[PDB]
Design a binder for this molecule. Structure first.
Ligand SMILES: COC(=O)C[C@@H](NC(=O)[C@@H](NC(=O)[C@@H](/N=C1/NCC(=O)N2CC[C@@H](C)[C@H]2C(=O)N[C@@H](CC[S@@](C)=O)C(=O)N[C@H]1C(C)(C)C)C(C)(C)C)[C@@H](C)c1ccccc1)c1nccs1
Ligand SMILES: [Cl-]
Ligand SMILES: [Zn+2]
Length: 253
């Protein structure tokens, strides 16, 4: 593996690693309370034997630049972070894969960047959502305070999240957990669009998902393909991420 640095539109440095391979170039986008280490820890990276893999730390996570403001964590800024990675490696075609809010980011990159040939959204759909301002602000307060890592650990543990997902929370600065949560009130509620007719768009979730309706709506509206994994909830579906990587490798082959 090699490390890289690029700069987002707003000057934020975005750091990541490149795992060379002769195959398709795949760009991995983690979720809010994660960093780039989840790709190896989940077994997703091992599932792609041939791909050239690019894995970034989003702004404010891991080795990337600090942000510490709500608007700095707007969805459009994450999109700019990913597009900067696409620039650095200079390809005409990329396949994007994102977990949870990372999936929403990957879909939005696909909407605006014609270099995205495929986008996979793991446990996030593409539809408009109603975000309660009160509840999100309350969650921001819970996660940014001294008890914030414990709050996330206890909740993810109680909902059956894999250990790597529980453990990743404690690697995120509490201030960036709060800012990223508030950032959701700056654009993340809108639906995503199809970028080009030839794009391959895939949504993945638990067959037990209590709200599959918006995933079906992406099938109809975007022509997306819906993949299911055996799990009673979205969070527990994260235990199947390596298996999903094997299915991605089949598509890339
Ligand atoms: C059934 O499974 C779930 O719905 C939980 C699942 N969340 C989601 O999929 C989506 N969000 C939501 O649905 C909803 N958001 C929420 N808070 C914003 C937010 O998300 N977070 C803030 C903190 C961060 C870790 C992340 C998160 O994770 N919060 C859990 C709670 C974690 S704790 C303790 O266990 C969460 O959801 N809190 C809700 C409420 C506060 C409204 C109760 C709405 C308002 C967007 C509808 C995310 C992907 C999203 C989609 C579209 C637009 C914006 C966000 C998880 N993803 C990762 C780990 S759990
Ligand atoms: Cl997330
Ligand atoms: Zn801590």
């Amino acid at each position: 593996r090699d490390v890289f640095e690029v700069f987002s539109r707003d000057g934020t440095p975005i750091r990541g690693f490149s795992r060379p391979g002769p195959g398709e170039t795949v760009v991995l986008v983690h979720g809010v309370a994660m960093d780039r280490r989840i790709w190896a820890e989940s077994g997703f990276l091992d599932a792609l034997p041939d791909a050239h893999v690019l894995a970034l730390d989003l702004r404010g996570r891991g080795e990337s630049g600090r942000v510490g403001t709500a608007e700095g964590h707007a969805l459009r800024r994450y999109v700019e972070d990913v597009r900067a990675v696409l620039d650095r490696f200079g390809r005409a075609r990329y396949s994007l894969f994102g977990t949870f809010f990372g999936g929403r980011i990957a879909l939005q990159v696909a909407a605006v960047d014609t270099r995205v040939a495929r986008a996979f959204s793991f446990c996030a759909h593409a539809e408009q959502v109603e975000i309660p301002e009160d509840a999100v602000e309350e969650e921001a307060v819970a996660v940014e305070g001294p008890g914030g890592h414990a709050y996330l650990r206890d909740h993810f543990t109680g909902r059956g999240a894999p250990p790597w997902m529980v453990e990743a929370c404690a690697r995120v600065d509490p201030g960036e957990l709060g800012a990223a949560t508030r950032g959701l009130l700056h654009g993340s509620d809108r639906r995503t669009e199809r970028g080009h007719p030839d794009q391959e768009l895939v949504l993945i979730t638990a067959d037990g998902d209590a709200d599959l309706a918006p995933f079906h709506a992406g099938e109809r509206r975007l022509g997306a393909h819906l993949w299911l994994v055996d799990a009673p909830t979205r969070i527990k579906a994260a235990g199947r991420l390596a298996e999903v990587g094997r299915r991605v490798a089949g598509v890339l082959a």
